[PDB]
Amino acid sequence: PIRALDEGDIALLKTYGQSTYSRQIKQVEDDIQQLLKKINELTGIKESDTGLAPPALWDLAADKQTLQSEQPLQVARCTKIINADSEDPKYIINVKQFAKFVVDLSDQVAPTDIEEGMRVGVDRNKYQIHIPLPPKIDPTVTMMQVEEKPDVTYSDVGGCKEQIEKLREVVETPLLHPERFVNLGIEPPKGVLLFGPPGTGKTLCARAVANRTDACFIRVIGSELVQKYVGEGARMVRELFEMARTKKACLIFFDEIDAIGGARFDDGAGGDNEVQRTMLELINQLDGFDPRGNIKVLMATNRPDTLDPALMRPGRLDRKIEFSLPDLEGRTHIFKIHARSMSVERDIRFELLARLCPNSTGAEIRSVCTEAGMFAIRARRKIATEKDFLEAVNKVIKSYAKFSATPRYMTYN
Amino acid sequence: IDINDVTPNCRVALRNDSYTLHKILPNKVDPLVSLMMVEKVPDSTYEMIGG
Amino acid sequence: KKTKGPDAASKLPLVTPHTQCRLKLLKLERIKDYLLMEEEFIRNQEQMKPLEEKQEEERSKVDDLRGTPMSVGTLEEIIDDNHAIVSTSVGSEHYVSILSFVDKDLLEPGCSVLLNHKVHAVIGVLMDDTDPLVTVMKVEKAPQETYADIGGLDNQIQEIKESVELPLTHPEYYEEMGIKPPKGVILYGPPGTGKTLLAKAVANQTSATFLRVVGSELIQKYLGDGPKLVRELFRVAEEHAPSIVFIDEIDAIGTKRYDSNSGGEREIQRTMLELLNQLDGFDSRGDVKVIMATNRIETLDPALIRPGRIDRKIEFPLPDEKTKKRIFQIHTSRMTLADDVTLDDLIMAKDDLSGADIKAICTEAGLMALRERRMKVTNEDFKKSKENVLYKKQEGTPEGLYL
Amino acid sequence: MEEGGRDKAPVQPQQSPAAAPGGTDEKPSGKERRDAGDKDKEQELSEEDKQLQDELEMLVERLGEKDTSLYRPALEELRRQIRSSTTSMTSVPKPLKFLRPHYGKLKEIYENMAPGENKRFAADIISVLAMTMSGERECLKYRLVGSQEELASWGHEYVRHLAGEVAKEWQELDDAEKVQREPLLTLVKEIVPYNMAHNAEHEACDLLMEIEQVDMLEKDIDENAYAKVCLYLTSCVNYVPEPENSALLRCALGVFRKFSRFPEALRLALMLNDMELVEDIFTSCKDVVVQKQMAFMLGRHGVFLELSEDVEEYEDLTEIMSNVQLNSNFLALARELDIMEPKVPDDIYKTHLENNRFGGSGSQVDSARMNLASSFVNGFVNAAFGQDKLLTDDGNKWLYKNKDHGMLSAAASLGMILLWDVDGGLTQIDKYLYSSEDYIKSGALLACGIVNSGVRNECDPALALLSDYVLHNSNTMRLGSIFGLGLAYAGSNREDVLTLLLPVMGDSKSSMEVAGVTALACGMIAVGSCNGDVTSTILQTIMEKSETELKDTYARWLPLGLGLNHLGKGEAIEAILAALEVVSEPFRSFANTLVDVCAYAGSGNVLKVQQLLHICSEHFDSKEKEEDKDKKEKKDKDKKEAPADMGAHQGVAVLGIALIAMGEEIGAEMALRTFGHLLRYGEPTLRRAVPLALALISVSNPRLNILDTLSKFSHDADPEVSYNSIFAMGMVGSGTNNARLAAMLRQLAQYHAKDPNNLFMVRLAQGLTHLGKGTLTLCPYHSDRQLMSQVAVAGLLTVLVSFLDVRNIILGKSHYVLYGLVAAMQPRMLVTFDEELRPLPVSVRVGQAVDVVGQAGKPKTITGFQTHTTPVLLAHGERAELATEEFLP
Ligand SMILES: Nc1ncnc2c1ncn2[C@@H]1O[C@H](COP(=O)(O)OP(=O)(O)OP(=O)(O)O)[C@@H](O)[C@H]1O
Ligand SMILES: Nc1ncnc2c1ncn2[C@@H]1O[C@H](COP(=O)(O)OP(=O)(O)OP(=O)(O)O)[C@@H](O)[C@H]1O
Ligand SMILES: [Mg+2]
Ligand SMILES: [Mg+2]
């Protein structure tokens, strides 16, 4: 029986209702909406065309000197040399992606200064050779060094002494004291892969090593190891290891190597094809008919079960280290370490919270120490109390965010 | 034209050689999702749809 | 610089009364008055102050030397003070000369470098290369909602406020004890129970640079572009001042990892790995706080939900009794209810009634009213909505199995 | 399109109009029968709001429009038998049939006359029958008549009757939300005779329900901040609320006095016939009000002193503005209520970060400017506190590691330390006053004058304490005496003291800076006429050499002598003052802008604001003569700083966008005091963090940097906020570190930021009333025009102490006996509830309910729950007195 709405019905409906000043209200709102547009249009996004050094510090040279820089000094193009015909001035070069060519050496450069494999400054027009270019050091590859010292010492890495000793036996002593490994002639194990449930300090210990590496600690940003064009990843890893074999005692960390490594297969789109190729290049570099040298590899994962076998076997990674959940003493020490900067009452027994947090991890221990004084901040106190910490534990772990077993459930006494 | 009209993700036809912006070529992408704007209107009026 | 670019919004200080009234008229008139004043002043002062001796002849010289169609190229290993190597979009390594206009500082390897078209020469630096697919995720028109619009979620709102607002409102409260403010809260709960509402609320009183994500737009079709869009997102977040990035529907890139056999379900895994690495890995993370919303917290791979990366898991449940009445009050205000349509009854009955259900019942109720040709909702107009909005739902146990 | 069942309505109501034209021929009684039936049907349909699309009207409008148009005048017969009901039945279809082109017949269709008992439609309908349309039409017609032909025809009376009836009947037709609309009607109409329209309306409507008056008071209060550019409405909205606050509401009259204070504190009109005429509020809130009345005693002690019979103990009692014992309760509460009252070290907050000593590993410095900044902080942070003094315990040698101006400022700081000490300060002052040192005595005189500006004590140790040095012709001592007397008697309006000091200005004996400081002090003294001083200043401006003013720097203080006297005053005399000040060079334009600004403190308008904003910058940047275009914007705060806290968020937009990004590069880009004045309430990273930082490190202009840092300090007068500190201490380095002036001025006030237990806000208790004396902050701001040897280079660094006429923050609870009250209350953030159908809670949640006396921040709220003997005034103005009531029977 739902009869439609007629035009007159709509017209009357729009005008029978309390609108003493409502048409004006809507009109003024529309005016405001149309005025914002004018205001921003006339104050649009400007002053963003940066890139200009202040032609005041070098203002004097920021002038016709620049034109003098232009015109002469022809812009060259980079290119390698694959041969240099001896006693025949002809050279052969491969520019990069354009094509190969045969080039003559410009008079300004003596042939002796130009060798095989070096980078030459070939010019446009007629590809002649000019001032040679030094060997490249790629930006992605060189943007990986730690070049800093993260603020985490070994002391703060609590709850695991055996693990730290195991790691130290391969990452620190075999480089800072070769004597112990000669008297017995024991080959220092190289390649330490850290397992563990999700969140246990596997990355904490890796960071801690960086504070005393006294050498390069290249950090493999796995996401960078994969790029669109094929072969990019293999070249990336090769340059990684080539820069590795250029200093003394270089340690290379592959955080979350699960991204680049995985069981091979040819079923789904031939696997990842390119990703598997990068993994294979890495494996070959780690072990193969080309002894690596003085470079060590640390890798961490949440699940080692999904690693390609040709990478889990010894040789590539020797010292596997479980990182199991902390013990009672481990938990007590972890609480003490992540409580030493907290305004906590002196009478707090941390040996009890440890028991009340079973099967927890270090991240949980933190999230409990924090969110512990958070209840104090909620109460507007300044020195948290043991009751606060205990409530935090009950509201973070064990019961966490879901406690189904509660209604008349007391069967464990 | 003045920058005001041109907004991010706005195809523009640039001149040759000079490369000075010329027109706001509307042509707003839409590769094959642009094949769904029904243009040939169908044939069905509520007169036939009964019940 | 780390500019704390705000949402560039709030141009509506908010009209206090919502009931059509001359108070509203006067206040909005004041708003328009100041806006017109601003327009007038800016135009007038642009026209006046005859600084027409502008262009700073010298800047004209610089523009003259840097020709037309300048090109965008990637700087590379810098060779000499007055010389550097550049790589054009075709990946060809030209060897250009850095002209004087360029500040020798600010030109690091990997920084996009402007060039002269004819004679490749570094002419100027470019510090804005944000991926045009990433800059589209900055909220610049703050959604119009306030914590008062949402109702019945006190405890579940205070938790987000204690990690998205207070830490930058009174940061002394936190340092005084030394606890690092919690970073990253995951808002998990059943469908249509808030989540996005609280997200928009926290967007409103931001005081920061909110970044919005979709949970699927991150996934990309070119091997690696996936685990570089996220990198660019968080690079932008950290470059800009304190920010909160809402990775909504993280159920998309969050599936529990498995020894897969396909390629797409490995690229997605790599994307999640990039997310994890950056959110909590060898690095740091400044005042960047991540809000994640999901419908199923049981599916997220244990890792993206860990008490060092995503703490304070909020548990938005189906609304309770009192919260139901609160939400009805908040969602029935701007309607001319009759004198016998008190909502103290429509609550109860079904144990399944979410906020989305409530708004549907309230809207298909006014629509029902506009069927007897009336503008004052009626109790029948409300009792005829429960049978038209809440339907198609599943049922439960067969009576008799239990009481 | 045929609609079954309903086809009848478009039928019979179609035949009836068919019978309208015929009438007398073949149907004489037909006319009456048809009109009666149709009127019955229309009334029946429109009376009950069972629907909102009127069936008969919808059918009629389409055709009957022309029929009724040609039948209203066709009959032309003037009798109620047909004409009255015809006019009624045609008026009804006005709102729904007539479109916009109804400005000419808007009244003619019906307003020609009121048929019979035209109130009948107004009877059964709840709220909407027509009366809302009628009210809109009547307001529109009044506007139309008053536009050009206010002297209208005989229509005056009929509309008056209709307006009275509607306002008295439809407003509360069912006790509905229609109440909010009656103010709209009575305002848009009868603007001039709104008093009389209200008198007719409230003759019965208010009294029939004393409860409704609360809604009226609420809307008028929330509206007072909005009114015409000329404060005739605002004045109108200030007279009208007095009766509503009267016995028509509770006899407490607290809100009545509040609103009566709003209109420039019109003492004679409202309050000067209440204190001596009520005499029945002694056990009621009269005492709490008078103790809360820290705004005016020149009209209170000039009446009670002459009477001497209102209270049997004149010496006892707060006696209006004897609020000195504010120091009593303040010290008591901070010592006991505030359990944290220790001495404050400085180096601790200086070198909080040990990373600042890297590399140098020492290199201690004791520069004079650093010493001066430390002395300034030491004088301020312990305001009203004479017990904590770490670096001031050795003053005999402390006061010397600084030039004469630094040590004079140190003396001023010492004087302020014992702020509001009628006699307790003398014990410390004398020991250095009896030093036979010119500048020591100068600073001591400053301090003595400062410490006597909060009581107006019977002993008046200002006129009898610093007048003896007043006449002496020594620059320093005379300046000290004049400044101290002016400060002490600023709020008070002692005309005799004004006259006595005036010859210092009127005489060439005093230096030019002496005359300037005298003008400042007199202005702070004056908020009324001060005609003698205005004549003196105008004479000075006449006899001030053009080159004198051009080189005049510490001389532009005068315009205060016209502003503070006429604070918040209208055009009637402001125009005369502006015209009389047209007798000088472009500096006359300077003074014009300054005087207008000093007048309109918070009176948000558009006329004067727009005109000045435009002309000032459109007439002075082009030519060599400039430096005016800064003061207008730098005073937009004034006349705009109190937009009910609404236009502030717009002023911020205009300021930040314009006066910096696209403002004048040099002079006008000093729009940094703008924000500082606008919001001295502490802001977390919303509207001051970025705007202040993005200019803090702008080494492009040292004056810019210094001014914006001082603003940074101001923005946190007394919130002790910490996030500012992330800059107030992080400024050293990464920008300005030790740029002498910058490195000093940063701390100099950034550590004035954490002033404890105080308030520098300019609004009174209700968040919307301005303090006449509170405007003194204009002194430390305009005097902060450049600071280049004005403040920055110590040339007169005593205003920085002058502005410390400052209200506290405490929220006491006692009842004329003592602080025997430690009850629980829950202040929180304030969310207004102007329009709501139900008594919903003002705030979302209870929030904090701290038992201790509330150090109420800016937007606080109501006291504790459970009706625990709630007060009477119910204003929460930091001095409320709780009254016994029936609780827990
Ligand atoms: N045994 C421990 N003692 C002290 N701190 C610990 C311990 N285990 C974990 N933590 C703390 O846990 C925090 C979070 O660790 P984080 O997530 O960065 O690394 P991870 O445990 O190796 O996990 P992931 O698998 O994500 O790499 C660290 O800041 C660290 O201080
Ligand atoms: N408790 C509530 N109070 C007020 N509004 C509510 C409440 N619960 C839901 N809503 C409303 O429900 C509407 C549906 O969107 P909403 O943001 O609630 O969905 P959601 O929970 O984010 O859903 P999704 O599961 O799809 O992410 C919103 O407009 C919101 O205002
Ligand atoms: Mg890790
Ligand atoms: Mg979003």
Side-chain angles (χ1 to χ4, degrees), chain D residues 765 809 811 826-831 848 850 854-862 875-876 878:
Chain D
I809 167 157
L811 202 30
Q826 59 261 316
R828 276 280 279 157
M829 266 323 155
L830 183 138
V831 157
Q848 187 45 258
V850 277
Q855 263 317 7
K858 169 155 273 302
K860 290 291 154 100
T861 190
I862 39 185
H876 295 40
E878 279 68 60

Side-chain angles (χ1 to χ4, degrees), chain C residues 149-151 153 190-197 249 327 330-331 355-356 359:
Chain C
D149 176 314
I150 189 54
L153 289 188
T193 192
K195 285 189 313 306
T196 310
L197 186 34
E249 297 98 355
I327 166 177
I330 178 87
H331 269 284
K359 198 210 190 182

